[PDB]
Amino acid sequence: PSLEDLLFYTIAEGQEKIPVHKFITALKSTGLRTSDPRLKECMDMLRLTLQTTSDGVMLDKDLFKKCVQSNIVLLTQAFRRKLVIPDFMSFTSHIDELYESAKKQSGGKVADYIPQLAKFSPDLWGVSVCTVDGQRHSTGDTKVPFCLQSCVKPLKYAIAVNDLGTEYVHRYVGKEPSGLRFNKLFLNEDDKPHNPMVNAGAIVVTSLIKQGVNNAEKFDYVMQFLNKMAGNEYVGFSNATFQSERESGDRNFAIGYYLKEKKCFPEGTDMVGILDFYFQLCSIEVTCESASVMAATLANGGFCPITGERVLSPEAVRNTLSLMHSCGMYDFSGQFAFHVGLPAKSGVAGGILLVVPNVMGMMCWSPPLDKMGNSVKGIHFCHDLVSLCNFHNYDNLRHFAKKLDPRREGGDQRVKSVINLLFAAYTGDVSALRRFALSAMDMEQRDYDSRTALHVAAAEGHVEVVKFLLEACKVNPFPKDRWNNTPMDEALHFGHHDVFKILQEYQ
Amino acid sequence: SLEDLLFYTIAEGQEKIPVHKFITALKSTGLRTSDPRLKECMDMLRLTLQTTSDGVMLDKDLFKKCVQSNIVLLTQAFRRKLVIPDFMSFTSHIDELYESAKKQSGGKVADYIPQLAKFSPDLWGVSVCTVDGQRHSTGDTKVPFCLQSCVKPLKYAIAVNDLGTEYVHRYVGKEPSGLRFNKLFLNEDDKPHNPMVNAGAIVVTSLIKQGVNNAEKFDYVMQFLNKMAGNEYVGFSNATFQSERESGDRNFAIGYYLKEKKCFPEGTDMVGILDFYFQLCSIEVTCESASVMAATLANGGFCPITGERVLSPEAVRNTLSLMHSCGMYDFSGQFAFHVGLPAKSGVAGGILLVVPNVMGMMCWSPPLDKMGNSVKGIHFCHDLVSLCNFHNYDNLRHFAKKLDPRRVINLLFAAYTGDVSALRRFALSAMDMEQRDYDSRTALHVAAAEGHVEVVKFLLEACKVNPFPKDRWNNTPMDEALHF
Amino acid sequence: LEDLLFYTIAEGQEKIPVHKFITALKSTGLRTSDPRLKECMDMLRLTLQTTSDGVMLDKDLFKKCVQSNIVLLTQAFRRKLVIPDFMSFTSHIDELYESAKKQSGGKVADYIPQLAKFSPDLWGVSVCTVDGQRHSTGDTKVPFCLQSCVKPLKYAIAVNDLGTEYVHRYVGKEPSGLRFNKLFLNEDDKPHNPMVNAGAIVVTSLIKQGVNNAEKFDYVMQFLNKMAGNEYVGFSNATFQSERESGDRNFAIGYYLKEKKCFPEGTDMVGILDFYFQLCSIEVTCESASVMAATLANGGFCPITGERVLSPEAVRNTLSLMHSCGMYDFSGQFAFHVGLPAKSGVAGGILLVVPNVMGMMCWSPPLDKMGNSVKGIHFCHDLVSLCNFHNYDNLRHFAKKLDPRRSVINLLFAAYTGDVSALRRFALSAMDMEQRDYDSRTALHVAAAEGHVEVVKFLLEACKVNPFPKDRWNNTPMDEALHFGHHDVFILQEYQ
Amino acid sequence: LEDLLFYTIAEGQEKIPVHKFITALKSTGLRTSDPRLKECMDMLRLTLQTTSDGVMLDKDLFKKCVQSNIVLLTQAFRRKLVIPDFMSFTSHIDELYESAKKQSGGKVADYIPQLAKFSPDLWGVSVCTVDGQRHSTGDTKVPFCLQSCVKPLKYAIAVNDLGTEYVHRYVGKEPSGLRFNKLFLNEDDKPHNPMVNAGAIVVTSLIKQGVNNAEKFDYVMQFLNKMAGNEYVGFSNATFQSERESGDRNFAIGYYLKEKKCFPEGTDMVGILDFYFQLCSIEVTCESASVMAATLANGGFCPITGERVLSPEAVRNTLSLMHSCGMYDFSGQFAFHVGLPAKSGVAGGILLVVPNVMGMMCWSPPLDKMGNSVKGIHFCHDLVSLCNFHNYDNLRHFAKKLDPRREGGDQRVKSVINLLFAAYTGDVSALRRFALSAMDMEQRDYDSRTALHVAAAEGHVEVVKFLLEACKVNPFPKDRWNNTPMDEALHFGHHDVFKILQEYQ
Numbered sequence A: 001p002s003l004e005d006l007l008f009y010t011i012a013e014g015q016e017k018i019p020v021h022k023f024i025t026a027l028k029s030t031g032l033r034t035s036d037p038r039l040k041e042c043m044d045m046l047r048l049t050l051q052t053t054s055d056g057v058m059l060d061k062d063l064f065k066k067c068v069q070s071n072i073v074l075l076t077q078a079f080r081r082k083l084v085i086p087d088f089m090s091f092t093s094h095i096d097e098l099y100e101s102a103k104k105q106s107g108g109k110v111a112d113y114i115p116q117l118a119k120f121s122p123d124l125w126g127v128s129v130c131t132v133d134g135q136r137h138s139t140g141d142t143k144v145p146f147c148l149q150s151c152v153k154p155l156k157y158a159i160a161v162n163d164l165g166t167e168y169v170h171r172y173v174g175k176e177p178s179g180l181r182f183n184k185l186f187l188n189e190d191d192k193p194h195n196p197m198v199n200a201g202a203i204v205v206t207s208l209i210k211q212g213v214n215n216a217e218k219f220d221y222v223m224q225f226l227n228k229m230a231g232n233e234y235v236g237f238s239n240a241t242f243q244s245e246r247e248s249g250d251r252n253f254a255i256g257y258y259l260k261e262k263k264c265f266p267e268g269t270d271m272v273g274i275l276d277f278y279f280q281l282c283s284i285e286v287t288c289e290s291a292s293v294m295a296a297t298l299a300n301g302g303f304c305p306i307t308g309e310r311v312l313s314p315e316a317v318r319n320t321l322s323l324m325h326s327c328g329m330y331d332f333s334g335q336f337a338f339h340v341g342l343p344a345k346s347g348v349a350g351g352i353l354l355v356v357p358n359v360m361g362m363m364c365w366s367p368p369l370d371k372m373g374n375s376v377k378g379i380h381f382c383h384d385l386v387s388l389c390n391f392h393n394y395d396n397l398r399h400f401a402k403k404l405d406p407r408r409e410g411g412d413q414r415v416k417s418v419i420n421l422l423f424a425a426y427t428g429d430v431s432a433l434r435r436f437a438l439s440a441m442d443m444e445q446r447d448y449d450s451r452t453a454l455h456v457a458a459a460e461g462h463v464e465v466v467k468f469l470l471e472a473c474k475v476n477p478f479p480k481d482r483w484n485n486t487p488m489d490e491a492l493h494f495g496h497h498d499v500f501k502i503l504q505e506y507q
Numbered sequence B: 001s002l003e004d005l006l007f008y009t010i011a012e013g014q015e016k017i018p019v020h021k022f023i024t025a026l027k028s029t030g031l032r033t034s035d036p037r038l039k040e041c042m043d044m045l046r047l048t049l050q051t052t053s054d055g056v057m058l059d060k061d062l063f064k065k066c067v068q069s070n071i072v073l074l075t076q077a078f079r080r081k082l083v084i085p086d087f088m089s090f091t092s093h094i095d096e097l098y099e100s101a102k103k104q105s106g107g108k109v110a111d112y113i114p115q116l117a118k119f120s121p122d123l124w125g126v127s128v129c130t131v132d133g134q135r136h137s138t139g140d141t142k143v144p145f146c147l148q149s150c151v152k153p154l155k156y157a158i159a160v161n162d163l164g165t166e167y168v169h170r171y172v173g174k175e176p177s178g179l180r181f182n183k184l185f186l187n188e189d190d191k192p193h194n195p196m197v198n199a200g201a202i203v204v205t206s207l208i209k210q211g212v213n214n215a216e217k218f219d220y221v222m223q224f225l226n227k228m229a230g231n232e233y234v235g236f237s238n239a240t241f242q243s244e245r246e247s248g249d250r251n252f253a254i255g256y257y258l259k260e261k262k263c264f265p266e267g268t269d270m271v272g273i274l275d276f277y278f279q280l281c282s283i284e285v286t287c288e289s290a291s292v293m294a295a296t297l298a299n300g301g302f303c304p305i306t307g308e309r310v311l312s313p314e315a316v317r318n319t320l321s322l323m324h325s326c327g328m329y330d331f332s333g334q335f336a337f338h339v340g341l342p343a344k345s346g347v348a349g350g351i352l353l354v355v356p357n358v359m360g361m362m363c364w365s366p367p368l369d370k371m372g373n374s375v376k377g378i379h380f381c382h383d384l385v386s387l388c389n390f391h392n393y394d395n396l397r398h399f400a401k402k403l404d405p406r407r408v409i410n411l412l413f414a415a416y417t418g419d420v421s422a423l424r425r426f427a428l429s430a431m432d433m434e435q436r437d438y439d440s441r442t443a444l445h446v447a448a449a450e451g452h453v454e455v456v457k458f459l460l461e462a463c464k465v466n467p468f469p470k471d472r473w474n475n476t477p478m479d480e481a482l483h484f
Numbered sequence C: 001l002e003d004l005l006f007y008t009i010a011e012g013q014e015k016i017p018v019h020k021f022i023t024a025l026k027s028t029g030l031r032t033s034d035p036r037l038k039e040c041m042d043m044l045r046l047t048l049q050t051t052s053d054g055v056m057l058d059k060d061l062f063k064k065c066v067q068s069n070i071v072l073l074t075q076a077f078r079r080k081l082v083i084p085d086f087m088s089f090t091s092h093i094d095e096l097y098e099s100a101k102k103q104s105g106g107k108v109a110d111y112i113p114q115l116a117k118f119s120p121d122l123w124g125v126s127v128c129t130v131d132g133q134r135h136s137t138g139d140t141k142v143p144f145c146l147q148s149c150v151k152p153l154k155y156a157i158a159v160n161d162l163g164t165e166y167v168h169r170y171v172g173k174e175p176s177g178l179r180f181n182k183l184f185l186n187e188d189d190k191p192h193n194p195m196v197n198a199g200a201i202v203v204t205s206l207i208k209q210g211v212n213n214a215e216k217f218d219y220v221m222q223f224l225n226k227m228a229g230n231e232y233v234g235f236s237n238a239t240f241q242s243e244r245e246s247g248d249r250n251f252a253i254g255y256y257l258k259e260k261k262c263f264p265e266g267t268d269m270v271g272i273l274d275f276y277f278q279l280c281s282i283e284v285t286c287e288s289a290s291v292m293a294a295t296l297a298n299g300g301f302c303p304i305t306g307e308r309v310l311s312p313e314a315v316r317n318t319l320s321l322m323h324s325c326g327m328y329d330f331s332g333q334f335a336f337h338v339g340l341p342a343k344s345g346v347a348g349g350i351l352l353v354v355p356n357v358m359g360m361m362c363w364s365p366p367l368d369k370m371g372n373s374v375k376g377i378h379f380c381h382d383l384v385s386l387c388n389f390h391n392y393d394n395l396r397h398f399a400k401k402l403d404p405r406r407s408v409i410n411l412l413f414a415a416y417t418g419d420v421s422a423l424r425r426f427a428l429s430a431m432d433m434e435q436r437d438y439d440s441r442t443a444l445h446v447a448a449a450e451g452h453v454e455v456v457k458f459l460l461e462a463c464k465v466n467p468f469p470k471d472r473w474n475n476t477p478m479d480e481a482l483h484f485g486h487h488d489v490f491i492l493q494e495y496q
Numbered sequence D: 001l002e003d004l005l006f007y008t009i010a011e012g013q014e015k016i017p018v019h020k021f022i023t024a025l026k027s028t029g030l031r032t033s034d035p036r037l038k039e040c041m042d043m044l045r046l047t048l049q050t051t052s053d054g055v056m057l058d059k060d061l062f063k064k065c066v067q068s069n070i071v072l073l074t075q076a077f078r079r080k081l082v083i084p085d086f087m088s089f090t091s092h093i094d095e096l097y098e099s100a101k102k103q104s105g106g107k108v109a110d111y112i113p114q115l116a117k118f119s120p121d122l123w124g125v126s127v128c129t130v131d132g133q134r135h136s137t138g139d140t141k142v143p144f145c146l147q148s149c150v151k152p153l154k155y156a157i158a159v160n161d162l163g164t165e166y167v168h169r170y171v172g173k174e175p176s177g178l179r180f181n182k183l184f185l186n187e188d189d190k191p192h193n194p195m196v197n198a199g200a201i202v203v204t205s206l207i208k209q210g211v212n213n214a215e216k217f218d219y220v221m222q223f224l225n226k227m228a229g230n231e232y233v234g235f236s237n238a239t240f241q242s243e244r245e246s247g248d249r250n251f252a253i254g255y256y257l258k259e260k261k262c263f264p265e266g267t268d269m270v271g272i273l274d275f276y277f278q279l280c281s282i283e284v285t286c287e288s289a290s291v292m293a294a295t296l297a298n299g300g301f302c303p304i305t306g307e308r309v310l311s312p313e314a315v316r317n318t319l320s321l322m323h324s325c326g327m328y329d330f331s332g333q334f335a336f337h338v339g340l341p342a343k344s345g346v347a348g349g350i351l352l353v354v355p356n357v358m359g360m361m362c363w364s365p366p367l368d369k370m371g372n373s374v375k376g377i378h379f380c381h382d383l384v385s386l387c388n389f390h391n392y393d394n395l396r397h398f399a400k401k402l403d404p405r406r407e408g409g410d411q412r413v414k415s416v417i418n419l420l421f422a423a424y425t426g427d428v429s430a431l432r433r434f435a436l437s438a439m440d441m442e443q444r445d446y447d448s449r450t451a452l453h454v455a456a457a458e459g460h461v462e463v464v465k466f467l468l469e470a471c472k473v474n475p476f477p478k479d480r481w482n483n484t485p486m487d488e489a490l491h492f493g494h495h496d497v498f499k500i501l502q503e504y505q
């Protein structure tokens, strides 16, 4: 048992008792939401002990201790800002802005090759987020469910590997893409398809899940995994879009038969059944909120964010995520993996599975597709993102451009590096001063006491630093500070004639 | 940073540092003595080490004089704050990988010209540089070799860095072609597949400094190539150059083809740009300098052992992204799956390997792979992620049997904007609230300077702080509270 | 006059023994049971038992026996047929048929049981000329399934009824090339050509648009029975079931077009698939197919009957596509080395055509690499290596090759309006200008009928033409001079 | 007996006016300048000035002038020339050239200033026969750069020297396809066929192995002068260099072939390439080109000489490759619609062969979107839609086409009479095989008698009943005796034929 009283005094912030009207009010300001299966005991014991009082609103310290005990491991992270995204409210206030910009794209034709997908109205703006720590935010028509379509093909693969291993699985599918051209073909020279991300590959994958049973046992074996990955949230089914997909189930028929001749399915397997199973799976429906938990399930290395289960073997997660990078969202995949860099997979319903490994998993949804087969608002959001954030899979963490990295604090990181411009003026160090001037830094940013590099540099009595500040950087030679002591006034306050030799001439 | 601590960190209470130990312990961070950021600290040493009774010992105040020029780094280096703190046992692992990877004997040597047939099959260079500056090298590393195809990223990068992504990709493609469809040296809309293959490398070559001759451009190249390797070994092999031009018929055909398809800039020469391409593909480097370059990419343009913004992060981004998929020869498909690292193979036997924001490496085994990659080079590149979580799409947290060698500012900025919560967050570490800025003011003195009551309250209630001592402006807490 | 025929056969007697008419009738090729000789054969059986015993025949009954199908006997016995020398020609054909079995190697079509039951050592050759000249050797009459070999005929059939344009708005005509091959479609919509499975399937979707599968099958059996002379044109159900439950590829191929709308309006898939399977399993003998190949060589018109089966317009297209896209991926090298339009079926059969000459059929179940027959192609390539049949060989000059390809009307047509040059050109053939049609009229009768001075002036005194002899209407040369109204000819008065 | 020719021309008169002998020899199609008719001309001109006036000729001198060139003049005046009626056939060709000249469309090969000079309104046709029958109309005598049409010849030449087996170790014998078309090689690391630039470059490395690019040029001009009967075989250096500066692609093709073992042992690249340019920049005129094209139709033997120039096997192979791989990609639709071997050139000319018949040449600088000629192809397709020349056409029962292998007026009265001789012998199966082929049973002979008259005179009712009800033949009209079928059944005596003829009155 820790000193959970620390948390207490962290919230009480003065008076004796904690009004639970506030504990939760701040718990969600960290992003985390009440409905976390990890904060169940911290809410069940909360209700259970909060009705043993004159009025169920206040708290004694000992009763709070009675509440958390088992859910403190996480609350620690929540309020200590160990959450993989510390500042969440302003960051989500940015995500809402990008939702506003991307939603406005009045384009794209609705996937109307069957009625179910044509019913979805064009003006639907699903945006749901889930970080690998459980914190979540969402905006738009996120509560609306929709058939997943091709978006299910990644998970398929993963599941297979998670039970079968990479070796056995890739004995029937390829590991590489094919490109804009060589796109018509079903198979590769090795007489097997290119990757799980293409229809033929997805079919071959489906032929491996649970060998020796029927399409009702396999179906539940799948819905089990999807429920685990989504925090047991919405894992639904649409028989309507299933019959629509099987009646208009066009080429996939031919793909199935051709595969049937070339031993593209394991020994003793029927094509007609596996095909129908493929349709069933492609007809599964979820909402943005529920898919976000799955994207995050992959971002967290297989382990679910809002529960903590060994859902998928990290092996399968790695394979899946790489194949989503390269062979991801249709012929666009390439230009995506280059221009946006994130592993993803689009579905013809309008939703895009989007993973940012070890950060978050997301879900955007706009049925209006683009001539490429991908979403309109979806992609506009995808690249209106990395243009403002350093999430590009091969960007730089240390010296990114003018982007934003919310992995470090929001307010504190603005002083973690403005101080690092100034302490290169206390020992007489210009190496760091030229390393920070060559890093494109605004050389007049003040510190806590409102003193730029010239005030401290002139206070120490260092000539070279001022030689780098007043001439090489064009820093103000007539500045003030919080004590109202100009560079000459501090050169006089502490007794430096060699710096006063500089300050007298630059008037 | 009171450099004092650094002294006491090595001196261990005494006032006598035998620099025999200060250097021998600086090298414990992996970092080697010859860091151009450590010029003053290495000159001054000797320069002041000969102004003593005997040149070997050093006390505090005389020690300050040497490190007061490069303390910013030194502190971070000894505090184990560099991107790979534990570097010694990690290197002791690398050495084990090099020892196990030697045994891969087979593989035919690049014998299509005499120069590449010289190199003996029993050469196994491995070199490592960290994006902070931490360096290590093992094997036949300092033997120079013709660089070859490994040039294609860098040049590309340079071009982008000078002309931006847009311009460059009006002439080259961004995706690969696949196992087959590979012979077709050009794509639907004019341009070739990617800068990682001969065609693309030629198109790229045609962009570097448009408007001068085929020797001044070469200098604009060697400049950047020297910057990216920390001004270390940048070489040239005319012997391999004219041999490459005497048996490079295919590259002649490919190269010209685009002239008819108008896939070159306006007023561009054909065979001259081909000669430029050969010049670059003949350049000599050693495993060490190459590793320094790869690290120059890993750190986002900025070179580790210099402090130079070499390339804009845009170009490094495009470059790495393309190295992921189109880097190696055809195997790049399986490579980006089993290893997930951006790479680039050279026909000399060398592999350029990058780990973003971690390190840059370089291996070299002249014996080549049946597909065009290196033999032992690839066995090593695969035995890496067999013990490390560097695969780009691996997981930081839950890595199974792998290893992850990756593992006062907050005081007063909290008491400045009007929030005590951040001062309470220090309670998880049990921090004594006597931390100062250079004005010599603890957590209570800044509460007196700003004028926030809540800070004083919390710090003098559940914590306890001394309200008497002074600051550097000569105003105690009570004297500085009412002064404003 | 049949008198000429009779005295040409009897030669030196007045009664002909049956031991000579039959034994000599076949030397020029034709077979006794020719449907063009049905009246003559029935009438020659009829009188074989209207006598004490049948071993003799005088001109009395002969004249009535042969006059029912006489024109054919005329063209045939005189060796006017497109292949006159047939006995040494066949004694050579067999000489190559010996070299065709030589190569024993080859894997038998064992991807279904039925074709694996055809024993390995099965070899047969059948030949039928557009003139009915039929010769065969080996296990020729043994029926086998018309495998892929059926695909060309189908095409033609559709064309013959629907035309070239309409049909080829749904199928291609060029090959796929060496590679770009399995891609069973073309850049724009249609498949590649009828000689492949895709094109053949789209072809099957055109035969009788709006009926039943049996109702179509009987139409096809109609056309084929016409082409083959109502010989053994059969059907195999046993093999029909096999290649349907083992032709998964053809299922996929077929359905692929379903999505891409490459079929006519509302055509069902599985029905056309099953119909196609029925077609690809038809039992025929080598000879029965050779008659069809001859039907194509003759431009659609059947040889051993004389029926306008297929429009020549379709036969042209069919034969060209059989040249370029005929065989499997060997088709190119085939069109180069052998140059004939052909088509192979993995049953072991090769349909081989020599346009405007003859039609053949080879059969050797043992197949080879590309899917064609072993012995059959050794024969095919051994052919033009000995004869100038190659579609681009030269008739006049040909190294050492052996081409067996080698009139009273000419006075009457040259006596209507007056061109005497022909009458001179008849001096090289040694034609006595007393030539007569049945009306018993020399050149002078017509020359005097129409009226021309130079004709009489040149013929009477230089050729010794007679102004006397009679005709069937009893108007001698000088009679027609004035009976119609010509004064000048009335010359014939001075020639007495 | 040459004596016979004399009377064939003189028409039983005394002497022959050359005015008539030459004017009659030209209507044969043959023209004065046939090198096989040198002796028959030089002698004429020689003996025509051994007379009081040079015009007439007796039988003796005439005979003893033609006695050396008689084996040809025989088939010439016998009409044995494989195209007997040549004047009306050329009167058809002229109408075709007029029909195709209408096409004021296409674009001029303007990728150099040389081929941009040739005006768009230039259109020519030339025709030579395996027998020597020659006719030309249009801008036929104008020279133009040969261009791609050159490729077959070399192949033949190569095969003519060291055989086909050796040659096709280096090039392929099949086409490539619509796509897989820009590919410079085949799976066996060889080009697809000699009809494409790559294949022709591989060929050029075979001509005379062991000499220089000027002696090879000569060895070529030899064969080209032989095949054309020493007609115009020229050369344009300006177009050679011009197409070398702005051609360039064959540079890439060349070097790629250099790396992939695609040339014979010890071969130079740039030199052989320059040779390829030289060949492709040759000048010829429609007439010469026609002679050359016909040289292949005749199986190697030149039409206007009688010399075995090329080994026939090479002729055959070349012809097949011109069928399948001939004119650019159109090659397929051309081999299917038209069935004739050909080869297109970027100058506007098309080489055209009709095996064992003739060879021609049409020239239209205005080109097609496919790279073929505009009027050059319009004429070629207006042709087989009017002639049974399509390689896979029909000879016996072909539709409303023509066949100049037999005379025009002959085709009627040969089978117009052969319809009737069966109605005399009593056979109906011949009429069921002729009527089932749509042979007009109303066809009349010189005496104006249909089958109803022949059969009515003889009196075979299985014929007449088949002609009255099953054919609907007219029982009323006349003949040359004005004795209608009723009156012939009346004159020869059969009341049954009158019994059935009464039925149609």
Ligand SMILES: O=C(Cc1ccccc1)Nc1nnc(CCSCCc2nnc(NC(=O)Cc3ccccc3)s2)s1
Pocket: B183, B184, B185, B186, B187, B188, B189, B190, D182, D183, D184, D185, D186, D187, D188, D189
């Ligand atoms: O190597 C083997 C056989 C082998 C041998 C051994 C083993 C296996 C297989 N065969 C070959 N190897 N290398 C070859 C040369 C490269 S192909 C020509 C280059 C291209 N030109 N345009 C291109 N694309 C366009 O899109 C053009 C375009 C532009 C504009 C508009 C439309 C289209 S690609 S061929």
